[PDB]
Amino acid sequence: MLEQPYLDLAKKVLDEGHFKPDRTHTGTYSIFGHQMRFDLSKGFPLLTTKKVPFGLIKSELLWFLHGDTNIRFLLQHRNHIWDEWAFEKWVKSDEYHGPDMTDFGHRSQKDPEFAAVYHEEMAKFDDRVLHDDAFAAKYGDLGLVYGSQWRAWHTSKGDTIDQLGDVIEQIKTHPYSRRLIVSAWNPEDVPTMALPPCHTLYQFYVNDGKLSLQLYQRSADIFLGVPFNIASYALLTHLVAHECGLEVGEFIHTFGDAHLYVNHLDQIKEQLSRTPRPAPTLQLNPDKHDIFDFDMKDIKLLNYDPYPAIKAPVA
Amino acid sequence: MLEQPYLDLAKKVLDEGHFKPDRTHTGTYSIFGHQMRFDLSKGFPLLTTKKVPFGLIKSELLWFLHGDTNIRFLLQHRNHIWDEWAFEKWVKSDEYHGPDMTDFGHRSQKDPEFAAVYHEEMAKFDDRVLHDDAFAAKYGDLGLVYGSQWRAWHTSKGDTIDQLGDVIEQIKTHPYSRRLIVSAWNPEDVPTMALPPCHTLYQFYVNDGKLSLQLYQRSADIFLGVPFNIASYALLTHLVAHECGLEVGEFIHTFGDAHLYVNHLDQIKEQLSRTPRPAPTLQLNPDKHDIFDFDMKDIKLLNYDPYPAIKAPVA
Ligand SMILES: O=c1ccn(C2C[C@H](O)[C@@H](COP(=O)(O)O)O2)c(=O)[nH]1
Ligand SMILES: O=c1ccn(C2C[C@H](O)[C@@H](COP(=O)(O)O)O2)c(=O)[nH]1
């Protein structure tokens, strides 16, 4: 059905998987080079064989579209995906006096109480960001995330480029350009970076009255991370169709290392026995139109009827 | 056989082609999103159903690998592909006194003698670049081509980054990195550019002892331009295997708008009736090893037995 392209992508790695060590050797089955297409006029690519939080997808897409870099917008939308990127530098200088949280990702995972001390000093940190302009301003700002790469590229001779906002004036005035790319990869500040962008680039395209978008994902954690990535970029494809006064066609996901983290093998076999359900259908607020100054309430998901959720081990 | 992935890519555009105007409306049949793989241990992807100049492929790849930007290296290797990018600014100021060559690409195409005056003032220009250091230095330097993007990215706080030379120290010391990308797309100087890079990026990958490379081509002229692109990047895949002391696996070509220029339809039907011949096999000089300071003589093609050539109308 609509997601069938996803569930085969997980079976091919279950058959071509080269075991590849990486991580800290930790374990992967991977393929290199894969492309899967979703026809967004049949429905929205949110999985029906795992319940995926559409709420944490739109909160983050609209952080991206507002051009935002600050953990504070996400936290005051209960969406906590980016938190330890900034809870990481909290565990760094000056005011960091007290607990350990020392490359903590490792020890909460293996912990009775290392994790709860991790878990509390983190909400200490979080309801701080929510509450003082100076802490928030200092440590809640990640610097180089997608809102800053998409809406403010940093130039020599200091400017900021709005990459997004210029390819959409470009899709309004020249529908047939093959130069409609946004690149989240700047190669200058990429070794001075903690997580090199994974959505490296995407490219839109107008065929007869309708818009599509293709994405180069440099590395994708098949089970835990692709469920979420398919709907973030098939959301943005509906939103820029919205603003360009166009119709909606295809979302093409193309992949570099597509992998299955090894600690995740029993779980993805379980969803692999489930049978699809019909996918939801997304509609968007008709009367506001500039997506950049949209809020949660203008995006709704109807008839999402998921299977239950499959809980992680994480990546 | 080995190239069979190419000839089907031309038949799918002959069946899915949306006619798309572009050019100056001029004419195209295109698809959006396509991926074709070549297993480089069966042989080299140079077409056997068109004779493709392996000589103009390696001259240009080694310009790229030397980090060169100057029409002069290519001209003193009889390879003239980049010439009118710099013959274009010749038709610009100061010393440009005399002929017309005014967006000339158009009028030589439709010309009795507009073209020969185009054709002579161009060799005037060419054996000039070959002969004075100042003209050559001034107009034979294109500025932003692949040697300058691959081997000298331009940073804020003026440096130049060697993108290539760092991912190969990276493939020698960390074979399993999914962050091995080179991007030829800088989004700052891309509207102040005549031809936005078409090979936007590529990404290498080490699976068990062997190297592969995947390429995102933003726009590719199926008949006249892909024959050449497959062997330029499947050359570079053999050359960096060479230097990393590794083996050779796959070349994955992934595509954005793959198109068939309309003036080219009878010609690509003709090659489409030909039957493959076995592809050549490339060997490289064993005893020199740093590819960056290689010359023509270290790359040889054996048993290339092509069909005849199919002459263009151009793109
Ligand atoms: O939603 C997400 C989150 C993470 N990753 C990945 C891919 C790898 O598992 C890891 C990044 O590691 P590198 O590929 O950058 O080493 O995170 C995704 O693909 N999607
Ligand atoms: O060897 C080549 C030469 C040119 N092009 C292309 C693609 C388009 O035909 C044109 C570039 O036009 P834009 O896509 O940049 O508009 O040149 C290639 O793909 N390969």
From Swiss-Prot, chains A, B:
**What's the domain of life for this entry?**
Bacteria
From the UniProt record, list the reaction(s) this protein catalyses. Answer: dUMP + (6R)-5,10-methylene-5,6,7,8-tetrahydrofolate = 7,8-dihydrofolate + dTMP
- Report one GO cellular component: cytosol
**Disulfide bonds, paired cysteine numbers:** none
A single GO molecular-function term is: thymidylate synthase activity
Which pathway is it part of?
Pyrimidine metabolism; dTTP biosynthesis
Q: Where in the cell is it found?
A: Cytoplasm
Where, in this chain's numbering, is dUMP bound? 23, 178-179, 218-221, 229, 259-261
- Which sites are catalytic? 198
Provide a GO biological process annotation: dTTP biosynthetic process
Which positions bind (6R)-5,10-methylene-5,6,7,8-tetrahydrofolate? 221, 315
Its Enzyme Commission number(s) read 2.1.1.45
Keywords attached to this Swiss-Prot or TrEMBL record, sorted alphabetically, are: Cytoplasm, Methyltransferase, Nucleotide biosynthesis, Transferase
Family in the record: Belongs to the thymidylate synthase family. Bacterial-type ThyA subfamily.
**NCBIfam families, alphabetized:** PRK01827.1-2, thym_sym
Assembly and oligomerization: Homodimer.
Which function does this protein serve?
A: Catalyzes the reductive methylation of 2'-deoxyuridine-5'-monophosphate (dUMP) to 2'-deoxythymidine-5'-monophosphate (dTMP) while utilizing 5,10-methylenetetrahydrofolate (mTHF) as the methyl donor and reductant in the reaction, yielding dihydrofolate (DHF) as a by-product. This enzymatic reaction provides an intracellular de novo source of dTMP, an essential precursor for DNA biosynthesis.
Q: What is this protein called?
A: Thymidylate synthase
